[PDB]
Symmetry: C3
Subunit: 356 residues, 3 copies
C-alpha cells in the first residue's frame, strides 16, 4: 500500500513518462482515461478508470456514450494536429466526455437509442474545434477553457434538436410558473447529507449516491485537497439552495451542488495557490456559483435549455480575472498548474524567492 | 456664494486632498458619498448628499438599501485589497448603489421587507468582484466598466429569484402581446416636459419628478455641461419613444429617458472631449441608446428580466470603441478624465501641442 | 469575350485604379456596387450590378431598400471619416445592404410601405458605427467583422419594433411546439436540386430560384472557386436539414442553405488558403454552420427573432480562431486576402519561401 500508493497519486507523471516509448495503443488508452478524469481537473488514468466504474454504476449506456465521445474527440484532435502535450494530459477529451454523457442524459428516447451514437460522434468531433479556438483566446490571458467547449456544443445540439425533433428529441425543459409549496417539517438531515456526494455525481449528470462517492474517491486518490474542496463546494450548493427555498427534490438530486463543487475545486488550490485567504475565496466562489447556477437554470429554461456548467465556467473565470493587491491571493501560472499540494509548494518557493 | 461655490463644483479634489490626513471614518463617508454620485459619473460628495436627499424624497426604503449597498461594497473592496485611488473616488461603490436601490424597486414584497437586506448585502459583496474582473479586461483597451457590474449582479439575482421564489419574489415582467391602443389627441405637452427630469430620476429607478430635478441639481452643482447633457439625453429618449409610438405612460414614467441620459452625459464631454462634432455624436449616441433600450427591454421581457442600463453600457462602449480619422473626435485617456470643462481644457492644450 | 473577360473577373483592381482620377460620383457608384457584392465576399461592381438585377427579379421594393441602405451607410462612413480603402472596396456598405433588404423582408406591412424608408435610413446610419467598433476589436486578431454589424443592427431593430409596434410591426416569429409530421415518400429530387440556388439566394433573403442562380453567376464571374463553394455549402445545408428531419418546405425555401453557403465561401480559399485540407475543413465548417443555424433559429424564435446570419458569423470566426500545427492549413493575412485563385498563388509563393 505505501509503496504502490505514491505511484497512483497526483498526475502520475512517471507513468506518463514510461508510456512515451510503449506501444501507441497503450498511450492512446492513457490519453482517454486522463481525458475522462479531467472533467474534475484530475490528470490521472486510474481516477479515469474509477470514474468509468462510477458511470457504469449509474448507467452503462451513459458510460458507453461518454467513452465513445472521449475517443472520437481525441482522434479528431490528432487529425487536426493539435498540441500533443495537451492531448496526452486529457485536455482534448474531457469536453467530449461530458458531451457523450449529457447527450444521453437529455435524450428523450431512453437507454440504448443506438441512433444517438451519430450525433454523439458529430458533436464530439466539434469539441477539439471549440477547444482549440477558445484556447487560442483564453491562453493569452493565461486562463483555461474549463468546460466552455462542452457547454457550447451541448447548447447548440439541444437547441438544434429540441423536444419536437422527429429523430433526436430532447427532454422537455419547462420554466417554473407557480411557487413551489414548501413544507419545511419534512426536511431530512440524512437526505441532505446524501446530497453532498450526489452533487459531486451530477458533475457527470449522475444522481446515484454511490456514483458520487466513487467520483469523490477518484478525486481523493489523485489529491486529498481537491476531494475536500469537491465535498465542501457541493455542501455550499446545498446551503444556497436552502437559502433560496429551493424544492428539496432538486437539492436531493444534486442539482444545486455540481457547479459549486467544480468552482470550489478550481479555486481551492488548483488555479489559485492554496492559502487560508484563497480557501475562503474558494468558499465564496462556490456559493456565488450556486446562486449563478440557479439564475442561469431559470434563464435557460425560458429558452428550453439546461444550464449544465455554464455557471461554473462563467463564475470561475470571473474570480480568476479579478485582481487584488494581496500577495497571499496568488493566481497560478498555467504552465505550473498540476494539483493543489504541488502548486502550494511552488507558491511557497516563489514566495521565498520574492523574499530575497 | 462665489467663494464657497468653487469649493463644491467639479470633483472637489481639494477636499479629497484635505481628507487624506483626517480620521479614517470621515474618509470612509467621503468614499460612500462619491460612490453614490458616480452613478451619474460625478465624483462629488455634496452631489452624493443631494442624490441621497432625492432618493429619500422618492422612498426612504430605497434610500436605505442603496446606502447599505454602497457601504457593503466599499468595505468588500477594502477587504479584497482593491486599488485605493479607485475606492476613494467612489468607483467601488456606485454599482452597489444601483444594486441596493433596484433590488428594492423590483421586489414584489414592498417597502420595508427587512429580509431583503440579506440579498442586498450578498449581491453588494459581489459588486467589487464583478468590478475588478471587468476592469482588468476593459482597462486594457482604456475603457470604463460603466454599470456592467450592477447589471450583471442584478440580472443574476433577478433570474435566481424570479417571480415565484417563496422568500424573495421579484415583480412579474410580462412581454407585450397586443398592440397598445394609441390615442394621440391625449398627448400632453406638460407631461412630456415633466418626463425630462423623470427620465433623469429613473437612472436610480425613481419616477418622482422632484427627485429627477434634485438629481439634475446634483449634476449641475458638479458640472453644468454634464447637467445639460443629462437633460438633452432624457429629451432624446422621449423623442425616440414617440418615434416608435410607445405608450405615453411609459414615456411619462421616464422609462425612455434614463439610458439615453446616461449615454449623453458619458459621450458629451466626459469620455470624449467636448467639441461641436462630439456634441452631435453624443446626441446620436443618446438616440441610438434609446432605441437599443426598447429593444433590450422587449428581449429581456421574453425571459422575465428588466433591461435596466444594459442598453447604456453596450451602446456607449460601442461608440467609444469606434475609430475615426477626425482629429476633432477625440477619446479621453482614462487617466485624464475628470469632468467636461476640465477635459476640454486638456484637449485644447494637447491640440496646441499637436500643432507645434 | 476572352479579352473583355479578364477585365471583369476578380476584384477589378484596374477599374478601381482608373476610377481614382474620375469624377467623384462615378467613384461613389463604384463603391455602392462593391458594397452590394461584398455581402458574398466579392469586391466587384459588375457582380454588384448582377446582384441588383437578382434583387429586382425577386422584388423591386427589396432592391430599393437594399440600395438605399448601401447609399446611406456609405455616406455615413464618409461623414465619420472612416478609412477610404475600406470604403472604396465596399466594406462600409454591405452590412447596410443586408439591413435594407431584410428590414423589407421582415416587415409586416408589405411591399411599398414608404414609411419604412425612415428606419431603413436610421439603421443604415448605424452600420458604419457597428462596423468601425467591431473592426477595431477584431482586426487586432486579424479577423474580419463578417456580417456581425448587420446582425446586431437587425436584432436590435426587430426587438425594438416587434410584432405589436403600431408603426413598424415585424412579422410574427413563432417557436415550434409540435413535431412536424414528416412524409418521406413526397421527397422531391427536383425540388432538392432547386434548393441549392435558393439557398444561395437567401443570403439576401431571396427565395426565387432565378435570383439564386443570378447570384451564383455574379460570384462565378468574380471567382469560379467561390461559386463552387457557394453551391457546395448550400448543398451541405440541405443534407444537414435532412439529417435533422427538417420540414421539406424549409429546405425548399433555402433556409438551410444560406449560412452554410457563406461559411463555405469564406473558408474555401477566401480566408484560408485553398488546399485539399482546407477544402475538407470548409465542407466541415459548412455542415457545422448549418447545424448551428437551426440551433440559433430555434433559440432566437423563443424571443421572437430570426437568426439571419448570426450562425455564419459565429461559426466562421470559430473555425478561423482555431489553431493547428498543420502547415497546409493556413490562415490568410487579411492584408493579403483578395479571392481564392490569387490567395492560393500567395500561399504557394510564401511556402516556397518557407522552403528556402
Ligand atoms: C456568495 C456571494 C453572495 C458573495 C461571495 C463573497 C466572498 C467572495 C467574500 C465574502 C467574505 C470575503 C472574505 C472576507 C475577508 C477576507 C480576509 C482577507 O484577508 C485580509 O484582508 C487580511 C489578511 C491578509 O493580509 O491577507 C482576504 C479576503 C477574504 C478571504 C475575503 C475573500 C472574499 C470573501 C470570501
Ligand atoms: C440614432 C441612430 C438611429 C443613428 C445615430 C446617427 C448619429 C450617430 C450620426 C447621424 C448624423 C451624424 C453627424 C452628421 C455629420 C457630422 C459632421 C462631421 O464633421 C465633418 O465631417 C466635417 C467637419 C470636421 O472636420 O470635423 C463629424 C461627424 C458628424 C457630427 C456626424 C456624427 C454622427 C451623427 C450624429
Ligand atoms: C459538422 C460537424 C458535426 C463536424 C465537423 C467535422 C469536420 C470539421 C472534420 C471532420 C473530418 C475532418 C477532416 C478529416 C481528416 C483530415 C485530413 C488531415 O490531413 C492530415 O492530417 C494528414 C495530411 C497532412 O499532412 O495534411 C487534415 C484535417 C482533415 C481535413 C479534417 C478536417 C476537419 C474535418 C473535415
Ligand atoms: C501488491 C501491491 C504491488 C503490486 C505490484 C507492483 C506495483 C507497484 O507499482 C510499481 O511501482 C514501481 C516503483 O518503483 C514502478 O517502477 C512500477 O512500474 C510500478 O508498477
Ligand atoms: C486545448 C484545451 C485547452 C487547454 C487549456 C489548459 C489550461 C489549464 O492548464 C492545465 O490545467 C490542468 C487541470 O485541468 C492541469 O492538469 C494541467 O497540468 C494544466 O496545464
Ligand atoms: C460494449 C460496452 C457497452 C455496454 C453494452 C451493453 C449492451 C446492452 O444491450 C442492450 O441491453 C438492453 C437490456 O439491458 C436491451 O433492452 C437493449 O435492446 C440492448 O441493446
Ligand atoms: C483515424 C484517426 C487517426 C489519427 C492519427 C493522425 C495523425 C497524423 O495527423 C497529423 O498530421 C500532421 C501533418 O502535418 C501532423 O502535423 C500532426 O502531428 C498529426 O496529428
Ligand atoms: C458511429 C455511429 C453509429 C450509429 C449506428 C446506429 C445504429 C442504429 O441501430 C438501430 O437502433 C435502433 C434504436 O436503438 C434499434 O431500434 C434498431 O434495432 C437498430 O438497428
Ligand atoms: C438524409 C437522412 C434521411 C433519413 C431517412 C430515414 C427515415 C427513417 O424512418 C423514419 O423515421 C421517422 C422518425 O420519427 C419516422 O417518423 C418515419 O415514419 C420513418 O419512416
Ligand atoms: C441520420 C439519421 C439517423 C436517424 C434516423 C432514424 C431515427 C428515428 O427512428 C426511430 O427508430 C425507428 C428506426 O427505423 C423508427 O421506426 C422510429 O419511428 C423512430 O423512433
Ligand atoms: C456662508 C458661506 C461660507 C460658509 C463657511 C465657509 C465655507 C467655504 O468653504 C471653505 O473654502 C475655503 C477656501 O479657502 C477652504 O479652505 C475651507 O476648508 C472651506 O470650508
Ligand atoms: C474598479 C471599477 C472600474 C474603474 C474604472 C474607471 C475608469 C473611468 O475613469 C474614471 O471615470 C470617472 C467618471 O465615471 C472619473 O470620475 C475618474 O476621474 C476617472 O478616472
Ligand atoms: C435609519 C434610516 C433609514 C430609514 C428607516 C425608517 C424606518 C421606518 O420603519 C417602518 O415604517 C413603516 C411606516 O412608515 C412601518 O410600516 C414599518 O413596519 C416600519 O418598519
Ligand atoms: C470589516 C471591513 C474592514 C475593511 C478594512 C480592511 C483593510 C485591510 O485589508 C487589506 O489587507 C491587505 C493585506 O495585504 C492590504 O494589501 C490591503 O491594502 C487591505 O485593504
Ligand atoms: C445584514 C442583513 C440583516 C437582515 C435582517 C433581517 C431581519 C428581518 O426582520 C423581520 O422582517 C420581516 C419582514 O419585514 C418582519 O415581518 C419581521 O417583523 C422582522 O422581524
Ligand atoms: C437555510 C434557510 C432556512 C430558512 C427557514 C426559514 C423559514 C421561514 O418561515 C417560512 O417562510 C416561508 C416563506 O414563504 C413560508 O412559506 C413558510 O410557511 C414559513 O414557515
Ligand atoms: C436566508 C432566508 C431569509 C428569509 C426567510 C423568510 C422570508 C419570507 O418570510 C416572510 O415573512 C415571514 C417571516 O417569518 C413569513 O411568515 C412570511 O410567510 C413570509 O412572507
Ligand atoms: C465586345 C466586347 C468589347 C466591348 C468594348 C471594350 C471593353 C473591353 O474592356 C476594356 O479592356 C481594356 C483592356 O485593354 C481597358 O483598357 C478598357 O478600359 C476596357 O473597357
Ligand atoms: C470596416 C469594416 C470591417 C472591414 C474588415 C475587412 C477584413 C477582411 O479583409 C477584406 O476581405 C474582403 C472580402 O470580404 C476582401 O475583398 C478584401 O480584399 C480584404 O481586405
Ligand atoms: C425608383 C426605383 C425603385 C422602384 C420604384 C417602383 C415604384 C412602384 O410604385 C408602387 O407600385 C405599386 C404597384 O406595382 C403600387 O401598388 C404602389 O402604391 C406604388 O407606390
Ligand atoms: C452628405 C454626405 C457627404 C459625405 C462627404 C463628407 C466628407 C468629409 O468628411 C470628413 O471630413 C474629415 C475632416 O477631418 C476628413 O478627415 C474625412 O476624410 C472626411 O470624410
Ligand atoms: C428618407 C426617408 C423618407 C421616408 C418618406 C416616407 C413617406 C411616406 O409616404 C406615405 O407612405 C404611405 C405608406 O406607404 C402611403 O400610404 C402614403 O400614401 C404616403 O404618403
Ligand atoms: C413624433 C412622432 C409622432 C408621429 C405621429 C403620427 C401619427 C400618424 O397617424 C397615426 O398612425 C397610427 C399608426 O398605427 C394610427 O394608429 C393612428 O390612428 C394614426 O392617427
Ligand atoms: C416617424 C413616424 C413615421 C411613421 C408614422 C406612421 C406609420 C403608420 O401609418 C400607417 O399608414 C397611415 C399613415 O397615415 C395610417 O393611417 C395607418 O393607420 C398606418 O398603418
Amino acid at each position: 500500500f505505501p509503496k504502490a500508493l505514491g505511484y497512483v497519486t497526483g498526475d502520475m507523471k512517471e507513468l506518463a513518462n514510461q508510456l512515451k516509448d510503449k506501444p501507441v495503443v497503450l498511450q492512446f488508452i492513457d490519453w482517454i482515461l486522463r481525458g475522462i478524469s479531467q472533467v474534475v481537473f484530475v490528470n490521472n488514468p486510474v481516477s479515469g478508470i474509477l470514474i468509468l466504474v462510477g458511470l457504469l454504476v449509474q448507467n452503462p449506456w451513459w458510460a458507453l456514450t461518454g467513452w465513445l465521445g472521449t475517443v472520437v474527440s481525441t482522434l479528431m484532435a490528432l487529425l487536426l494536429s493539435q498540441d500533443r502535450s495537451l492531448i496526452a494530459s486529457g485536455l482534448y477529451g474531457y469536453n467530449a466526455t461530458l458531451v457523450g454523457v449529457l447527450m444521453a442524459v437529455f435524450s428523450d428516447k431512453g437507454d440504448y437509442f443506438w441512433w444517438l451514437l451519430l450525433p454523439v460522434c458529430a458533436m464530439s468531433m466539434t469539441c477539439p474545434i471549440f477547444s482549440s479556438a477558445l484556447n487560442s483566446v483564453l491562453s493569452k490571458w493565461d486562463l483555461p477553457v474549463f468546460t466552455l467547449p462542452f457547454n457550447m456544443a451541448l447548447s447548440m445540439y439541444l437547441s438544434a434538436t429540441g423536444h419536437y425533433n422527429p429523430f433526436f428529441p430532447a427532454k422537455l425543459v419547462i420554466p417554473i410558473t407557480t411557487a413551489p409549496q414548501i413544507s419545511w417539517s419534512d426536511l431530512s438531515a440524512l437526505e441532505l447529507l446524501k446530497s453532498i456526494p450526489v452533487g459531486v455525481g451530477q458533475i457527470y449528470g449522475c444522481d446515484n449516491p454511490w456514483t458520487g462517492g466513487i467520483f469523490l474517491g477518484a478525486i481523493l486518490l489523485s489529491s486529498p485537497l481537491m476531494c475536500l474542496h469537491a465535498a465542501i463546494g457541493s455542501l455550499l450548493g446545498i446551503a444556497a439552495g436552502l437559502s433560496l427555498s429551493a424544492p428539496f427534490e432538486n437539492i436531493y438530486f444534486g442539482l444545486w451542488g455540481f457547479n459549486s463543487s467544480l468552482a470550489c475545486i478550481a479555486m481551492g488550490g488548483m488555479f489559485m495557490a492554496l492559502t487560508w485567504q484563497t480557501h475562503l475565496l474558494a468558499l465564496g466562489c462556490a456559493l456565488f456559483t450556486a446562486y449563478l447556477g440557479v439564475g442561469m437554470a431559470n434563464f435557460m429554461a425560458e429558452v428550453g435549455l439546461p444550464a449544465c456548467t455554464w455557471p461554473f465556467c462563467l463564475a470561475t473565470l470571473l474570480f480568476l480575472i479579478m485582481t487584488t493587491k494581496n500577495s497571499n491571493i496568488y493566481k497560478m501560472p498555467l504552465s505550473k498548474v498540476t494539483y493543489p499540494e504541488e502548486n502550494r509548494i511552488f507558491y511557497l518557493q516563489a514566495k521565498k524567492r520574492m523574499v530575497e
